[PDB]
Amino acid sequence: AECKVTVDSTDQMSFNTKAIEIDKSCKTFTVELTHSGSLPKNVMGHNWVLSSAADMPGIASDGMAAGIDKNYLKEGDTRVIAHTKIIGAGEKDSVTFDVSKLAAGTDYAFFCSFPGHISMMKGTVTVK
Template structure:
């Protein structure tokens, strides 16, 4: 994590990540405590636009896999994740303004072999909606 990063607040083995209608997450880094066996990301969309116009989700994957996951998921509406994509470690449902969702995943899956990222797979959002994910 670099000095300019906005780290998500982590309480225990969970965090709340907020998204909005300006294609932004409120954090660009998530640091998972090494003591966690599983970790939960709660996503809240504080905007007002519907899923079809400004849907957001959180996808966890290796950084190198992000572009291909997004490209392969473009036509896979409404989730924008290709069914059965084994490069995806975990993901939330796609939500629109006012919605919320969560995903819990096994921390062992992101301990080694990274770097890992979290991102939104809605078409066009990858450039602005992504961040680092690491275990410390």
């Protein structure tokens, strides 16, 4: 529970947290994403994507065009540090990543890249 967090995403297009803090001693960290509700992934699907705050607009605009089978992220996009797949209600997915990819000086963010969700579904990730 030091190096893992669970974030829920809902039928009301929200994540249940706005800020995730990763302790510096973790070597790898896991984010587990759940989706309470009843709506299918092509109506209200959600993923969790991590990048520098500066790259977030570019990933989201390109991802919307990639389609649901590419999890609304451009294939092999080098700006994405880590991501889950798009999940619908009653499903779940995790992603584990190397904490030393998060370097000193830069500001990081998480968001959902499903079309239209980023206005409400985003926040900050800080290593502490």
